[PDB]
Amino acid sequence: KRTKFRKQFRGRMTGDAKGGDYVAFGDYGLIAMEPAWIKSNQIEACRIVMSRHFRRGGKIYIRIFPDKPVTKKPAETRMGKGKGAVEYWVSVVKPGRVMFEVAGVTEEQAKEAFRLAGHKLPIQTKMVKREVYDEA
């Protein structure tokens, strides 16, 4: 979620997913197909959603995380400066990036627990399995 001290501001641009893998930290994982921002909530609700459908088990891994601060109209117009320091925090994700990963649950077990968290997400997604093994 919202983090400790920073640079405090940003603009915006979009490429393709750089540091997201295919797999990591578990059997099954979740992958975003569309460039977008994810907020402090969303993924926070996604954790809660997924975990609710589990035993509550601590087997869930979230590779994503909010860094980028966003802003908003104090009330209205253009009068004055750029403003809105805390409105919300976002985490940019690009396609192919892996978002969440789970541990030790079965096939349908994590299929449905990803599906529940599929909603609450501004983008379409697909879960996965491991073939490419890369650790270095």
């Binding site: 997913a17 197909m33 192919g96 990036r97």
Partner: peptide
Amino acid sequence: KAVQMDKR
């Protein structure tokens, strides 16, 4: 040895 996978 090593395999380069296509994202997306």
